[PDB]
Every structure is written in structure tokens, then in C-alpha cells.
Amino acid sequence: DILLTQSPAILSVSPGERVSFSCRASQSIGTDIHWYQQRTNGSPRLLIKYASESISGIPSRFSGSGSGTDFTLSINSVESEDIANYYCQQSNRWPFTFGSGTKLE
Amino acid sequence: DILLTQSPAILSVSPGERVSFSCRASQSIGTDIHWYQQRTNGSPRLLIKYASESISGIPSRFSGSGSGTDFTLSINSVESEDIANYYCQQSNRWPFTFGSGTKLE
Amino acid sequence: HGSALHWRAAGAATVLLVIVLLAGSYLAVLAERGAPGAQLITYPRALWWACETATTVXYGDLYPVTLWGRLVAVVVMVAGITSFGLVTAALATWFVGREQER
Amino acid sequence: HGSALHWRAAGAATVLLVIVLLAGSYLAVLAERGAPGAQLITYPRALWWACETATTVXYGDLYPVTLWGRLVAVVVMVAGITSFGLVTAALATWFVGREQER
Amino acid sequence: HGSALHWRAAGAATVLLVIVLLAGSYLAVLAERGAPGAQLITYPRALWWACETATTVXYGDLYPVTLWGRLVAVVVMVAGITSFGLVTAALATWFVGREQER
Amino acid sequence: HGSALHWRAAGAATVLLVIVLLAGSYLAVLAERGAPGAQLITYPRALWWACETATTVXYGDLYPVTLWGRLVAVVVMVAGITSFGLVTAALATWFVGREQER
Ligand SMILES: CCCCCCCCCO
Ligand SMILES: CCCCCCCCCO
Ligand SMILES: CCCCCCCCCO
Ligand SMILES: CCCCCCCCCO
Ligand SMILES: [K+]
Ligand SMILES: [K+]
Ligand SMILES: [K+]
Ligand SMILES: [K+]
Ligand SMILES: [K+]
Ligand SMILES: [K+]
Known part of the structure; x- marks a missing residue:
């Protein structure tokens, strides 16, 4: 099955900087990657679908990019509410799989 | 031809644990992998066909998973009769080939 | 409804397709x-x-790998080929009738 | 057996296919x-x-690489194309006859 | 201009294609x-x-991945299939008329 | 040589193909x-x-990448499609004539 690798597992950044989460698939999956945010004791929340497509209700500072095997989730000017775990998910091949997750500091 | 690599060659496990044999192909072969069991001085016996399909007569603790290049044979709660050599075999491309085998301890 | 059979069947094939x-x-x-x-x-x-x-x-960008996915595929092929073939047959019937009048 | 030739041949092509x-x-x-x-x-x-x-x-998921595998492939293509073409011809003959009556 | 309708439409389909x-x-x-x-x-x-x-x-060397690229593709397929089908229909009409005379 | 035109042209298309x-x-x-x-x-x-x-x-196993290779390809496609289309037209003419007699 498709392995999604999120490295590093922890990103530490100063308030206001631009941060980039990395997601790498074990094989080409076009743009079939989706991003989720999970805060402490919360349910996951969709941030970006199909690598770059924005979702209504999500702050404009969230963006996504990449295609093939390497994907990036970016936050322009990180603020306190962005503190959470970030997961990528592929829907290119069955079964759907999740990345291991990156924590934001 | 297609090389199938079974590593490690020997798996040592406590009676009752879940064990996983690994089989890796030198190229993508979908789910065209089959698993065999050979006990001491015995003939090989089919356990799993097409990566995950079960065979009648084989204990339910035997299962298989994987697709592409990485395949796994699993035994839920290993018992004494499971002591044998385990081989994978591909039928995706001619000629059919065998893995080098993993011994269970 | 007495419109030409070949045009009715062609329409039916399109909707069915x-x-x-x-x-x-x-x-x-x-x-x-x-x-x-x-x-x-x-x-x-x-x-x-x-x-x-x-x-x-x-193209080869997408295709079924299962038995039932492939069976569905075959139905789609046949329905597609038959439908387009039925249009061609309707076109021929039209041209033949018009060439008699001409 | 005096049923329409075009339907007989179409049936024959299907069975042969x-x-x-x-x-x-x-x-x-x-x-x-x-x-x-x-x-x-x-x-x-x-x-x-x-x-x-x-x-x-x-699709390109499967194809022959040998001489004899490719020859078999060509026979399959021709038989397939001819069969579907024979159905279309039968459909035309049907429509033409029915448009004369209409 | 009273040339055969089937040849006119065939020409039109070619230019349109x-x-x-x-x-x-x-x-x-x-x-x-x-x-x-x-x-x-x-x-x-x-x-x-x-x-x-x-x-x-x-062949699969090139193909669209977007919604609008695929819609354009479908138009191209249909136009292509219809055009060639219209030529075949024109050929049939020709052969039918000539076999009556023969 | 007064054999049916549709069979002559079909033979000619085959040889030409x-x-x-x-x-x-x-x-x-x-x-x-x-x-x-x-x-x-x-x-x-x-x-x-x-x-x-x-x-x-x-299938996609082989295809041209050059301008002139692709032009050659297009000629091959058209000749192929036209040839098979000419056979279908000949089959229709046959069936139509035989259904009149029937
Ligand atoms: C002919 C279409 C039938 C679709 C059946 C879906 C297959 C179920 C998978 O077990
Ligand atoms: C026309 C079909 C003939 C099939 C022959 C099989 C090829 C034998 C391989 O040496
Ligand atoms: C039917 C053809 C329409 C082409 C439209 C181009 C798509 C624009 C991309 O947003
Ligand atoms: C229409 C076929 C012409 C073939 C020409 C070969 C191309 C020469 C390469 O410069
Ligand atoms: K392909
Ligand atoms: K085709
Ligand atoms: K066709
Ligand atoms: K293809
Ligand atoms: K094709
Ligand atoms: K193709």
C-alpha cells in the first residue's frame, strides 16, 4: 500500500514566520493528497484537498503545493491557533492511507 | 527476471505473538504474489494466493497483505505447528520466481 | 408518433448510453x-x-483490475460501440433515402 | 430457415467472436x-x-511481446472489428427496410 | 448545388473535424x-x-487531467467518431446506389 | 469484370492497407x-x-515522438479506419440487396 512519510515529526517555529510541512509518498499519486488539522483532544479538520485546493472556513494563510511524490502544506505567518498535529492522506489507490503526522511548535 | 527478497531469513518469536514475514519484489507486481509453507522433510503447501486470498484448509490465523513491491504474510498467535520455512512466489511476469525463504522460530 | 425509426433508436441509444x-x-x-x-x-x-x-x-490512465470491474468495463465498451454503430446506421438510412429522391 | 440474413450473420459473428x-x-x-x-x-x-x-x-495494462502472441492479437482485433462492423451493417439494413415501409 | 448529400455531409464533417x-x-x-x-x-x-x-x-503518451481538459477530450472523441461514421455511411449509400444499377 | 463494386473496393482497400x-x-x-x-x-x-x-x-507499448513519425502514424490511422469502414459499407450493401430478394 501507499506509504506517506511526514518528516520531521516536529516543527518548531517563531510566531510570524512561514512554516512548511512535508509529505512524501512511496509512489506517484498525482495531486491526490489531502491535509488535516487535529488540535488537542479534537477531531481532525480538512484544510486542503487535492494538494492545493482551499476549503471554505479555513484561513487564507493555509496553502498547499506539490505533485507526484512530494507535497507541501504551508502556513504564512504562524499564530497560536495553528498549534496542532498535521496529517496528509492519499486517495490515489486503495486503500486510503494516512501519514504519521507532524506537530507544530 | 523478478527478484523476490525475503528478509530477515530467520524470525524468532514467543509462542502466542503475532509474526510477519516480509517479501519484496524488484519491481511492481500488483498482487500477483503467493505464499507457501514447507515443514521439515515435507512438500511445500499453499497458504495464501494473490497476496491476500485465503485457502480452504488453512487456519484462519494466516493472513496476507500488500501490493506493488512490498508484501507481508502474517500469523496471529504463532503456535508449534507453524514452525517451518516460508516462501513467496510471483506470477506477474515470466518466468515465475521464488523468494529465498524465511524460517520461523 | 411516426417519426423515422432510425432516429428514434439513435436517440434511445444515446439516452441509454x-x-x-x-x-x-x-x-x-x-x-x-x-x-x-x-x-x-x-x-x-x-x-x-x-x-x-x-x-x-x-488512454491507460485508469482501468479496472477486478473481475466485476472488468465485467462492468465490457458492458460499457459494448454499449458504447453499439450506440455509435447505431448512429452510423441511422446516418446511412438517411443518406440512402435522400439519394433516391435526388 | 428464412429469417433475415443480416441477423443470422450477426448472430454467427457474435458466436464466432x-x-x-x-x-x-x-x-x-x-x-x-x-x-x-x-x-x-x-x-x-x-x-x-x-x-x-x-x-x-x-488500455495498455496487458499486451503480447512475442511474434506469435502479436499474430494472435491481430486475429482478435480483426475478428472484433469485423464482428461489430457486421452488427452495424445489420442495423442499417433493418432501418432501411423499415423506412421504406414507413 | 445538387451533388449527393452524403458526399456533401462527409466533406462538411471533414472540415469540421x-x-x-x-x-x-x-x-x-x-x-x-x-x-x-x-x-x-x-x-x-x-x-x-x-x-x-x-x-x-x-496511446497514453498524452492525456488531460483536468475537468475542462477532459470535456474538451470528449468533444474531440465524439466529433472524430461521428465524422468517420458519416464517411462510412456515405460509402454505403454510394455502394447501394451502384449495386442497383449493376 | 462486372463483379459487385462494394466487394472490389473492399479488396482494394485491404491490399492498400x-x-x-x-x-x-x-x-x-x-x-x-x-x-x-x-x-x-x-x-x-x-x-x-x-x-x-x-x-x-x-496499447502504448510503442509510439512515434517525431513530427514525421506522427504524420506517418496519422496516415496509418486514417487508412486503417477508412479500410474497415469500407468493409462495413460493403457488408451493408450485401445485406440490403439480399433482404430485398428475401
Ligand atoms: C455488473 C455490475 C455488478 C457490480 C457488482 C459490484 C461488485 C461487488 C464486489 O464484491
Ligand atoms: C495463430 C496462433 C498460433 C499459436 C502458436 C503458439 C506459439 C508457440 C510458441 O513457440
Ligand atoms: C469546452 C472548452 C472550454 C475550455 C475552457 C478552458 C478551461 C479554463 C480553465 O479554468
Ligand atoms: C510521409 C512520410 C515521410 C517520411 C519522411 C521521413 C522523415 C525524415 C527525417 O528527417
Ligand atoms: K499506457
Ligand atoms: K479504438
Ligand atoms: K469503429
Ligand atoms: K493505451
Ligand atoms: K484505443
Ligand atoms: K488505447
Whole structure:
């Protein structure tokens, strides 16, 4: 099955900087990657679908990019509410799989 | 031809644990992998066909998973009769080939 | 309703083809999910796949790997080929009648 | 038996096509085994390959690499194309006769 | 101008097909640029893609990944299949008339 | 020689198609050699490529990358599609005449 690798597992950044989460698939999956945010004791929340497509209700500072095997989730000017775990998910091949997750500091 | 690599060659496990044999192909072969069991001085016996399909007569603790290049044979709660050599075999491309085998301890 | 049979059947084949494309998309996804490595597993691209399948184009970007996915594929091919063949037959009938009058 | 010739031949082409698909599947595997790298080497997927070949779809998931596998392929293509073409011709004949009566 | 209708329509389909190929090439590139990974993004190969698409060949070397690129593709397929089908219908009408005289 | 026109033309299309397949094979190799990465560069597989191209199958195992290789390809497609379409038209003419007698 498709392995999604999120490295590093922890990103530490100063308030206001631009941060980039990395997601790498074990094989080409076009743009079939989706991003989720999970805060402490919360349910996951969709941030970006199909690598770059924005979702209504999500702050404009969230963006996504990449295609093939390497994907990036970016936050322009990180603020306190962005503190959470970030997961990528592929829907290119069955079964759907999740990345291991990156924590934001 | 297609090389199938079974590593490690020997798996040592406590009676009752879940064990996983690994089989890796030198190229993508979908789910065209089959698993065999050979006990001491015995003939090989089919356990799993097409990566995950079960065979009648084989204990339910035997299962298989994987697709592409990485395949796994699993035994839920290993018992004494499971002591044998385990081989994978591909039928995706001619000629059919065998893995080098993993011994269970 | 006494309009030409060849145009009625052609219309019927078109409507039926659209139904096959939609049903084919649905049934292919239903069949292909559960099979490791399958790519024909979301509806939008499944409809695109159905189109190239019905026209016999295929490109190879998407295709079924299961027995039931392939059976669905064959139905889509036949329905597509028959439909276009029925249009051609209708066109011939039109031209033949008009050449008699000419 | 004086039923319409075009429907008889169409039926005959269909039955013959099914025979070609089954024989093609068998002969392709027989031809392709022994050639390193060949993928058309088990009967179930060989029949699937024969279907997409006869309809001219293809996808590119399977294809012959040997001389005799390719010859078998060509027979399957021609039989498929001819069969569907014979159905279309039968449909035209039907429509033409019915438009005369109309 | 009282030349045979089937030859006029065949000519019209050919000219229209050429227009579809050129417009299809232009619109596919316009649609596919902006989509990461898209290969149908320069005009010369887009015209080549349009040709194999209109003939239903496909090879799989090029294909659209966007919604609008795929819609353009479907138009190209249908226009291609209809055009060739219209030629076949015209050929039949010719043969039928000539066999009556013979 | 007063045999049916539709059968004569069908025979002519077949012979011409065989010529196109052989000439296409030769000209494709001549065109594709000199282009880095080109796979359509030896005659035996070039003839196989011509066959799947003329039938519109495609598989995607072989295809031209040059301008002149692609032009040769288009000629092969059109000749193939026209030839099979001419056979279908001949079959229709046969069935139509026989249904009048029936
Ligand atoms: C002919 C269409 C039938 C679709 C059946 C879906 C297959 C179920 C998978 O077990
Ligand atoms: C026309 C079909 C003949 C099939 C022959 C099989 C090829 C034998 C391989 O040496
Ligand atoms: C039917 C052809 C329409 C082409 C439209 C191009 C798509 C624009 C991309 O947003
Ligand atoms: C229409 C066929 C012409 C073949 C010409 C070969 C191309 C020469 C490469 O410079
Ligand atoms: K085709
Ligand atoms: K194809
Ligand atoms: K392909
Ligand atoms: K056709
Ligand atoms: K095709
Ligand atoms: K293809």
C-alpha cells in the first residue's frame, strides 16, 4: 500500500514566520493528497484537498503545493491557533492511507 | 527476471505473538504474489494466493497483505505447528520466481 | 408518433448510453474498492474512465483490475460501440433515402 | 430457415467472436510463456486482454511481446472489428427496410 | 448545388473535424496549464494528442487531467467518431446506389 | 469484370492497407531514428505498431515522438479506419440487396 512519510515529526517555529510541512509518498499519486488539522483532544479538520485546493472556513494563510511524490502544506505567518498535529492522506489507490503526522511548535 | 527478497531469513518469536514475514519484489507486481509453507522433510503447501486470498484448509490465523513491491504474510498467535520455512512466489511476469525463504522460530 | 425509426433508436441509444456511463461509474467504484492498488475508486475520474472506455480510446490512465470491474468495463465498451454503430446506421438510412429522391 | 440474413450473420459473428476470445486467450498464454518479461501469461487476465483487444480499447495494462502472441492479437482485433462492423451493417439494413415501409 | 448529400455531409464533417482538432488543441492547453503534473501543455503535441483522440487510438503518451481538459477530450472523441461514421455511411449509400444499377 | 463494386473496393482497400502497413513501418523507423529516446526504431516491432495503430488499439507499448513519425502514424490511422469502414459499407450493401430478394 501507499506509504506517506511526514518528516520531521516536529516543527518548531517563531510566531510570524512561514512554516512548511512535508509529505512524501512511496509512489506517484498525482495531486491526490489531502491535509488535516487535529488540535488537542479534537477531531481532525480538512484544510486542503487535492494538494492545493482551499476549503471554505479555513484561513487564507493555509496553502498547499506539490505533485507526484512530494507535497507541501504551508502556513504564512504562524499564530497560536495553528498549534496542532498535521496529517496528509492519499486517495490515489486503495486503500486510503494516512501519514504519521507532524506537530507544530 | 523478478527478484523476490525475503528478509530477515530467520524470525524468532514467543509462542502466542503475532509474526510477519516480509517479501519484496524488484519491481511492481500488483498482487500477483503467493505464499507457501514447507515443514521439515515435507512438500511445500499453499497458504495464501494473490497476496491476500485465503485457502480452504488453512487456519484462519494466516493472513496476507500488500501490493506493488512490498508484501507481508502474517500469523496471529504463532503456535508449534507453524514452525517451518516460508516462501513467496510471483506470477506477474515470466518466468515465475521464488523468494529465498524465511524460517520461523 | 411516426417519426423515422432510425432516429428514434439513435436517440434511445444515446439516452441509454448516458445511463450506462453513470451506472458504470458507480458500479466500477463499488467493484474496485477493496482491491489493493486499484485506481478506479472515486466517482469523478470513474465517469471520465467510462467515457474513454465507451469511445474505445483507453488512454491507460485508469482501468479496472477486478473481475466485476472488468465485467462492468465490457458492458460499457459494448454499449458504447453499439450506440455509435447505431448512429452510423441511422446516418446511412438517411443518406440512402435522400439519394433516391435526388 | 428464412429469417433475415443480416441477423443470422450477426448472430454467427457474435458466436464466432466468443470463440475467438476464448481461443485467443488460450493461444496468447501458450505463445507468451517462455518470453522473459511477458505479462500475458495467465488465462483469466488473458481473456480480459482479449476483450479490450477485440473492442480496440487497449488500455495498455496487458499486451503480447512475442511474434506469435502479436499474430494472435491481430486475429482478435480483426475478428472484433469485423464482428461489430457486421452488427452495424445489420442495423442499417433493418432501418432501411423499415423506412421504406414507413 | 445538387451533388449527393452524403458526399456533401462527409466533406462538411471533414472540415469540421479539422476545426475541432485545432480548437481542441488550443482549448486543451488553455485548460491543462495551471494543473501540477499536466503534460498536455504545449500546442504541437496537443494537436498530435487531438489526432489520436479523434481516431480513438489513445496511446497514453498524452492525456488531460483536468475537468475542462477532459470535456474538451470528449468533444474531440465524439466529433472524430461521428465524422468517420458519416464517411462510412456515405460509402454505403454510394455502394447501394451502384449495386442497383449493376 | 462486372463483379459487385462494394466487394472490389473492399479488396482494394485491404491490399492498400497492407501496403500502408509495410510502408508505414519503413517510414516510421526512418523518421524516428535520430531522435533520443525513440522506441519505434526497428522494423519488426514497427510493423506490429502499425497494426495496432491501423486498428486503433494503441496499447502504448510503442509510439512515434517525431513530427514525421506522427504524420506517418496519422496516415496509418486514417487508412486503417477508412479500410474497415469500407468493409462495413460493403457488408451493408450485401445485406440490403439480399433482404430485398428475401
Ligand atoms: C455488473 C455490475 C455488478 C457490480 C457488482 C459490484 C461488485 C461487488 C464486489 O464484491
Ligand atoms: C495463430 C496462433 C498460433 C499459436 C502458436 C503458439 C506459439 C508457440 C510458441 O513457440
Ligand atoms: C469546452 C472548452 C472550454 C475550455 C475552457 C478552458 C478551461 C479554463 C480553465 O479554468
Ligand atoms: C510521409 C512520410 C515521410 C517520411 C519522411 C521521413 C522523415 C525524415 C527525417 O528527417
Ligand atoms: K479504438
Ligand atoms: K488505447
Ligand atoms: K499506457
Ligand atoms: K469503429
Ligand atoms: K484505443
Ligand atoms: K493505451
